[PDB]
Design a protein around this ligand. Structure first.
Ligand code: CUO
Ligand code: CUO
Ligand code: CUO
Lengths: 901, 69, 278
């Protein structure tokens, strides 16, 4: 299971399991009669015709010969994809990279037996699909890369304008349909039939991919990928039938509009890689420019609906009558197609032919055009107007470009990079907000998190909206931070909330805070509700041992967060790392930043979460590089499918973005909120650079102390003390903080809290699996509290090179913890034989929760968990005491659970 | 609602199996299960005692689960 | 008047600004006609978009333009206060020379297009210079604004002259001055009289005028205490940093200006029947 998007990858890289799932899913899809069936989806493309016109005339729904064309098809592919996923496919249609030369059609489609991809039945026709490939299909290379598909697409890619791009792109698209389907009536060559062939999806997946690559290039260019200035009117109108409420698929329905269509990510699918041919995006752009350098001559065609599919071939001829083959392009169409005419001409690069002819642009030569229908019958030339000849020069001088930006884009610049001038807007914006009592006010915004507690709808119960410990913990915060920032901008802000990279060696607290005088609004805030100002009892939080790896203090934890894979395991590292700062700043104080119920009010708090937010972003995409994308629904998603309170409840900031896009899945992407960070770098390391540092840790085996932390209902600190062999001398293994307070909502970390003990243990020289246990002491903001609920540390050793295994050693006897889920399918598990009194049995997966109550069978050793052992398999497990009584001695119930990233 | 002594609260989907152990929040009535009521939605549910102690009185843990045919 | 060199420069300038255009596809409509079209907002408010003409007649050779004819809509949209993205309609009427209306079928609907380019707006603009003074709201107060008030007041407070703060406060309360060497004393403060607001209104300005002479940017901030009072103004509450607004040392007799705040809060209802001050 991958948490993230249904990825679409190349077809040639067929993985047997993947193929099997696809075939099976497709088979099921074909079978289902339902509206989200194969037949129903196919119908969208053309026959039977799904579209009504207001006269009642029926026409094929697919939009061709229009700008909207990529949008419509994008949705269609997704529609089919969603169906497959429902069927059980690992999400994604495979894309066939037609652009590159290929000896034959994908085997995936080719396999004759037991292959759902091979063909499909057409209910109305009552016949199955057919394909007859044209030999022309394998384009002959001069360069080897120099192929027609490649060249045609390349030209499309070069175009800056969306509209210019679309026409070239669409025509190219058509070529595959023609060559594959050929003459046969049932295939891809026909507008009506094409949707039926399963190859259709592979092709469209590729076509969508091409569009995606273009968008990426545009982004690289700095040109707008998401919107098009041209064909403004077209974008706005919805694409049927997707818009229809009949449409079973909500997502496609939501993104019915072409305006909506551009963002694929919303679609929730991604591609393994943008790279076109071998080339990277950066590389591709360079390649394209090179082409620009040389002059070229083009023939332009004006195309309109010629009521049918046809192939056109034209040759350039000199006066002599000598001719050479100019080029080919195809038109996909059929009866009942909607009428269409291109706004601009379709360009074809004539230059090579002319050179062969040894013709000059100025020279008088003729273009001969022949239009052949699929059948092979010739069409009248009347269908197409005579072609134009144009010359495109190469070079440029003073090219002013127009690329728009800053509709509502804010940026959260570094507090350090701050300027005096910049500083003023922050102070003014905050001040004006602070003085503001309205629902929009500062007093109100802080209220969401800490006291007073709002969110239940007139529960009169109160309830801290602050979500900590939950899987959602960063989601609620990320939205809150923006809520703070958005409130300021409305109040009169120039820049986004400044973020502070506290990981780096801290010389002193930011000047932004320290300047208590001059009534700095950033330093503190008067609650005004209850009274009392926001005070902070700073802690040392300094002393620098070493930077750039093995950084003592905060950075390691943060670095440790990025290190961790998977989101669920990540969130813990994410929060705990964040938890630390709150303590040093808030200190001991009643109303301090450390006090969860109050900490919201502190000015630093509003900004501070932003600094943490930045870390989330670097990690979010960072994972993508890993080919393990985990943003949205991943493991414990159930919590996510519910809006963040009180943001949804009617009484929020009333910020249209917030109140509406309160949904966690929405909040996952920051780019939607209209703000960006000045940089991705942490501790002066760039994403690529930092990725290296991570590699260092993986280099050395480190032992970790697992923690099952559960809601204490208060914020406090813990000092982990490791026992020593000699007397019992403890040692400062380290310390971490657990935020919370009074009537907070209950929480418990489903995932373990990776905490690195390694150096400490080696001193004492103990073994992770062997008798190794320690007694920590935890403390409230100021005073002592029940150390009792540890709960007993679950040692885990993370092997060096060849990682992402992680070993988990629970324990045997005197263990205390609920079902711990190490997750990360592929993890290793064991048990601690601690206390010789209890041997190695430890039942295993007794059964289900009822069994977990400690039912163990009479001596029937349902083997699974033994002495020092391990286990690779996933799924839901469990461990109970060897004997029924042996269970009660310490309540050995730990219900291990092992799911996917 | 058998036994008047215990009222209608009965937490609801407390969370996950760990929560099911009887963790219920301090009076935070995470509403879902009330008196004579009903529920159409699918997915995984659960029902725990109204209060933490009220749980131990009879071990009201029934973890209802609602999947597909 | 422009020279070729000059004209080119003039043209480029036009390029600098973004423009929105309506495009028309024209073909032979067997006759001469005048077309007028208006841009209309959803409201139905419309403004005259523009005009163009077609010269033709019977026995004309057939013709169709390869490209669209562009017309610059931008001014009309601005008047409409429409945005490119906004949804508006173009209404077209084709009139023959005779004045008879032609069918709209002759011309296809217009397309809209965008021309560059944009920029980011810096807050360069300056509002009013101190012409006359203005007493802006204490709430609308800005950090920058706040400083002038504190500085002006402080400089006044430290000022013992007749113009000083110690003296200005003296008019109303103790010590009592106004009778001309009566040696009787006399509180100048006029309360209960019909004049009560008149004396005060002048005194308030006296306080403000004293500050401006002392170095003030804005007028005395006013607080609308009628509205529901969440808490005392920050202007006062910030006792620290030696805020001059919070209190003042009499210096004459001694003793600082202390205040024993009362609850003066609890909100029952606003907008009519407001309990308390309002
Ligand atoms: O586009 Cu409708 O067919 Cu590939
Ligand atoms: O999270 Cu609520 O506190 Cu930093
Ligand atoms: O005091 Cu003399 O008036 Cu308000």
């Amino acid at each position: 299971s991958m948490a993230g998007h249904g990825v679409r990858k190349e077809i040639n890289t067929l993985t047997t399991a993947e193929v099997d799932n696809l075939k099976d899913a497709m088979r099921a899809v074909m079978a289902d009669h339902g509206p989200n069936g194969y037949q129903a989806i196919a119908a969208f493309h053309g026959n039977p015709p799904m579209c009504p016109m207001p006269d009642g005339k029926n026409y094929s729904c697919c939009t061709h010969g229009m700008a909207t064309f990529p949008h419509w098809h994008r949705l269609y592919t997704k529609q089919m994809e969603d169906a497959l996923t429902a069927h059980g496919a690992r999400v994604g249609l495979p894309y066939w990279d037609g652009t590159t030369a290929f000896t034959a059609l994908p085997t995936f489609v080719t396999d004759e037996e037991d292959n759902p991809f091979h063909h499909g039945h057409i209910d109305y026709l009552g016949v199955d699909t057919t394909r007859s490939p044209r030999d022309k299909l394998f384009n002959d290379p001069e360069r080897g890369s120099e192929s027609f598909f490649y060249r045609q697409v390349l030209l499309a890619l070069e175009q800056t304008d969306f509209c210019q791009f679309e026409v070239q792109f669409e025509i190219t698209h058509n070529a595959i349909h023609s060559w594959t389907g050929g003459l046969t009536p049932y295939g891809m060559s026909t507008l009506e039939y094409t949707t039926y062939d399963p190859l259709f999806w592979l092709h469209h997946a590729n076509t969508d991919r091409i569009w995606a690559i273009w968008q990426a290039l545009q982004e690289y260019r700095g040109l707008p990928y998401d919107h098009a200035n041209c064909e403004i009117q077209a974008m706005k109108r919805p694409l049927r039938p997707f818009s229809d409420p009949i449409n079973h698929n909500a997502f496609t329905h939501s993104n019915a509009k072409p305006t909506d269509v551009f963002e694929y990510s919303r679609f929730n699918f991604q591609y393994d890689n943008l790279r076109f041919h071998g080339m990277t995006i950066k590389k591709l752009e360079h390649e394209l420019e090179k082409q620009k350098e040389e002059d070229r001559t083009f023939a332009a065609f004006l195309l309109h609906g010629i009521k049918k599919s046809a192939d056109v071939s034209f040759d350039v001829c000199n006066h002599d009558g000598e001719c050479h083959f100019a080029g080919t392009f195809a038109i996909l169409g059929g009866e009942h197609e909607m009428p269409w005419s291109f706004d601009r001409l379709f360009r074809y690069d004539i230059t090579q032919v002319l050179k062969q002819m040894h013709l000059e642009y100025d020279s008088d030569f003729t273009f001969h055009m022949r239009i052949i229908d699929t059948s092979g019958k010739q069409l009248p030339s009347d269908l197409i107007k005579m072609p134009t000849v144009e010359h495109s020069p190469g070079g440029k001088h003073h090219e002013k470009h127009h690329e728009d930006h800053h509709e509502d884009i804010l940026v959260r610049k570094n507090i350090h990079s701050l300027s005096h001038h910049e500083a003023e807007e922050l102070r003014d914006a905050l001040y004006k907000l602070q003085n503001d009592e309205s629902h929009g006010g500062y007093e109100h915004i802080a209220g969401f998190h800490g006291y007073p507690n709002l969110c239940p709808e007139k529960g009169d119960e109160k309830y801290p909206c602050c979500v900590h410990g939950m899987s959602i913990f960063p989601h609620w915060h990320r939205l809150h931070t923006i809520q703070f920032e958005r409130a300021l901008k409305k109040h009169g802000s120039h820049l986004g909330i400044p973020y502070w990279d506290w990981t780096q060696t801290i010389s002193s607290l930011p000047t932004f805070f320290a300047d208590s005088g001059n009534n700095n609004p950033f330093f503190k805030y008067h609650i005004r509700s209850i009274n009392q100002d926001t005070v902070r009892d700073v802690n040392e939080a300094i002393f620098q041992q070493t930077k750039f790896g093995e950084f003592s203090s905060i950075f390691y934890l943060a670095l440790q967060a990025l290190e961790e894979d998977n989101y669920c395991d990540f969130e813990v590292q994410y929060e705990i790392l964040h938890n630390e700062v709150h303590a040093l700043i808030g200190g001991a104080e009643k109303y301090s930043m450390s006090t969860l119920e109050y900490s919201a009010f502190d000015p630093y708090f509003m900004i501070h979460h932003a600094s943490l937010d930045k870390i989330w972003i670097i990690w979010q995409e960072l994972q993508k590089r890993r080919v393990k994308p985990a943003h949205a629904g991943s493991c414990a998603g159930d919590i996510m499918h519910v809006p963040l309170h009180p943001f949804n409840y009617e009484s929020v900031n009333n910020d249209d973005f917030t109140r509406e896009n309160s949904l966690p899945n929405a909040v996952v992407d920051s780019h939607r909120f209209n703000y960006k960070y000045d940089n991705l770098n942490l501790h002066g390391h760039n994403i690529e650079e930092l990725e290296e540092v991570l590699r260092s840790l993986r280099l050395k085996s480190r032992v970790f102390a697992g923690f099952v932390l559960s809601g204490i209902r208060t914020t406090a600190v813990v000092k982990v003390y490791i026992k020593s062999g000699t007397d019992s001398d403890d040692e400062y293994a380290g310390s971490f903080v657990i935020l919370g307070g009074a009537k907070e909502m209950p929480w418990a970390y489903e995932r373990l809290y990776r905490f690195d003990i390694t150096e400490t243990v080696h001193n004492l020289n103990l073994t992770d699996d062997h008798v190794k246990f320690r007694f920590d002491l935890k403390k409230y903001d100021h005073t002592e509290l029940d150390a009792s609920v540890l709960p007993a540390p679950i040692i885990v050793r993370r092997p060096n090179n060849a990682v992402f295994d992680i070993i988990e050693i629970p324990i045997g006897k005197d263990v205390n913890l609920p079902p711990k889920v190490v997750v990360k399918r592929g993890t290793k598990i064991m048990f601690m034989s601690v206390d010789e009194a209890v041997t190695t049995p430890m039942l295993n997966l007794g059964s289900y929760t009822a069994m977990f109550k400690c039912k163990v069978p009479p001596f029937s050793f349902h083997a699974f968990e033994l002495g020092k052992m391990y286990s690779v398999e996933s799924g839901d497990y469990f461990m109970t005491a060897s004997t029924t009584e042996l269970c009660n001695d310490n309540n050995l119930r730990i219900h291990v659970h092992v799911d996917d990233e």
